[PDB]
Ligand binder design. Structure first.
Ligand SMILES: *[C@@H]1O[C@H](CO)[C@@H](O[C@@H]2O[C@H](CO)[C@@H](O[C@@H]3O[C@H](CO)[C@@H](O)[C@H](O)[C@@H]3O)[C@H](O)[C@H]2NC(C)=O)[C@H](O)[C@H]1NC(C)=O
Ligand SMILES: *[C@@H]1O[C@H](CO)[C@@H](O[C@@H]2O[C@H](CO)[C@@H](O[C@@H]3O[C@H](CO)[C@@H](O)[C@H](O)[C@@H]3O)[C@H](O)[C@H]2NC(C)=O)[C@H](O)[C@H]1NC(C)=O
Ligand SMILES: NC[C@@H](O[C@H]1O[C@H](CO[C@H]2O[C@@H](CO)[C@H](O)[C@@H](O)[C@@H]2O)[C@@H](O)[C@H](O)[C@@H]1O)c1ccccc1
Ligand code: NAG
Ligand code: FE
Ligand code: ZN
Ligand code: ZN
Length: 340
């Protein structure tokens, strides 16, 4: 009745979802799929209600008829006086990151280097950087630009998956879910941190959250911001503090999507759920916190302050915006569920 089946992608999200289900008196239950695309299908069938998505998947879901419901909102230095749930979303910065020690590596000498992507089809890890590379290159052969990569979601046998490591046992190599060691923002950044790749396509927040003691993980423990450099499009290299002037693009925030006939219901349930387990929530941190998962960004990014209303009741094209939407169309002409 006032119920939403959340779609978890992978066993680790399934685990976090089950805790949330317990804690919500089952006002929220869970469905699990191996990929984000399969989750989108369960929602289309009506077997799951919603899940939080990167802009790149919002475009996929968007063509299949799903709509953005609420968006992730993180800390701000403006729009401070108004509440988080009513505050407009600012978007994040897609950046290219390298080690300072890898001197002379610039945006112009990326050909034949090793890359770390969050996953195929994602905004900062794939659509933006590959879109730029296909445009600058006049060729749709992005499968040959980098010598080796870890781009979760690609053909496990291709060079685009050579750098991926799989799980603690070597299985699930290159799967586009957290079982794959170098998946998502954290994984792609770990891929560069462990010097597996030369460059990581992540967002600007990732660098800051996994350096200078912010993360207590074993591989991030000793990482220092000064040991990293951002690659700008003009050919320069800048400190990570200069992201506002050295990013590849500003990306629309990840957002919760659902089938439109369920949008209203999913919205109400979620606003109540964050009042309980949110940042200033009734039951967080003592019983449960929806937006924490020890740096793993399970279900939601860990730096989320709240899920905000959209208002202007935007379709997915308006949400993603005309600039971003045309970018994806361009890149995809290089190659239901395939919905339009
Ligand atoms: C890769 O190159 C393509 C082709 O140039 C880029 O797409 C182009 O993007 C611009 C800006 O988004 C579009 O211009 C816009 O045109 C509309 C009217 O058509 C106008 O109202 C806007 O003010 C703006 O001038 C252009 O239409 C679009 N071209 C195509 C064929 O889609 C694309 O953005 C590049 N990809 C990346 C990631 O940079
Ligand atoms: C690049 O991404 C990082 C990570 O999100 C951004 O740095 C963060 O900046 C915010 C403010 O914009 C800081 O939030 C504030 O922290 C202070 C405590 O130091 C507190 O007064 C506020 O209540 C709020 O929590 C945040 O601390 C900081 N993150 C870290 C770990 O330094 C940065 O703004 C992004 N830059 C670009 C170009 O987007
Ligand atoms: N508020 C987001 C808007 O969506 C459209 O806006 C982004 C740009 O977002 C700006 O947001 C403000 C705060 O709202 C920040 O201060 C700026 O730094 C950001 O650039 C567009 O690029 C994109 O087209 C997007 O669709 C929105 C308004 C109302 C309802 C839903 C979304
Ligand atoms: C379950 O949903 C009902 C209906 O809104 C609400 O009153 C109750 O607080 C919810 N229980 C929990 C623990 O979320
Ligand atoms: Fe993203
Ligand atoms: Zn810009
Ligand atoms: Zn509209």
């Amino acid at each position: 009745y006032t119920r939403v089946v959340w779609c978890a992608v992978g066993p680790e999200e399934q685990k976090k979802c089950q805790q949330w289900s317990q804690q919500s008196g089952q006002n929220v239950t869970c469905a699990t799929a191996s990929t984000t695309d399969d989750c989108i299908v369960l929602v289309l069938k009506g077997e799951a209600d919603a899940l939080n998505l990167d802009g790149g998947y919002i475009y996929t879901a968007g063509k299949c008829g799903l709509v953005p419901v609420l968006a992730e909102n993180r800390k701000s230095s403006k729009h401070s006086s108004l509440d988080c749930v009513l505050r407009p979303t600012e978007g994040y910065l897609a950046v290219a990151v390298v080690k300072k020690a890898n001197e002379g590596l610039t945006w112009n000498s990326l050909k034949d280097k090793k890359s770390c992507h969050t996953a195929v089809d994602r905004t900062a890890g794939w659509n933006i950087p590959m879109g730029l590379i296909v445009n600058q290159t006049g060729s749709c052969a992005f499968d040959e630009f980098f010598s080796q990569s870890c781009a979760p979601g690609a053909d496990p046998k291709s060079r685009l998956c050579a750098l991926c490591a799989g799980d603690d046992q070597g299985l699930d190599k290159c799967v586009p879910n957290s079982k794959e060691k170098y998946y998502g923002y954290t994984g792609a950044f770990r891929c560069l941190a462990e010097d597996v790749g030369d460059v990581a396509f992540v967002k600007n927040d990732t660098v800051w959250e996994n350096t200078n003691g912010e993360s207590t993980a074993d591989w991030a423990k000793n990482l220092k911001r000064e040991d990293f450099r951002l690659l700008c499009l003009d050919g320069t290299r800048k400190p990570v503090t200069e992201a506002q002037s050295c990013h590849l693009a500003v990306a629309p925030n990840h957002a919760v999507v659902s089938r439109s006939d369920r949008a209203a219901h999913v919205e109400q349930v979620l606003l109540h759920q964050q009042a309980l387990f949110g940042k200033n929530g009734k039951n967080c941190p003592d019983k449960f916190c929806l937006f924490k998962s020890e740096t793993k960004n399970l279900l939601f990014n860990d730096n989320t302050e709240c899920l905000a209303k959209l208002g202007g009741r935007p379709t997915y094209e308006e949400y993603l915006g005309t600039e971003y939407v045309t970018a994806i169309a361009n890149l995809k002409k290089c190659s239901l569920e395939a919905c339009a």
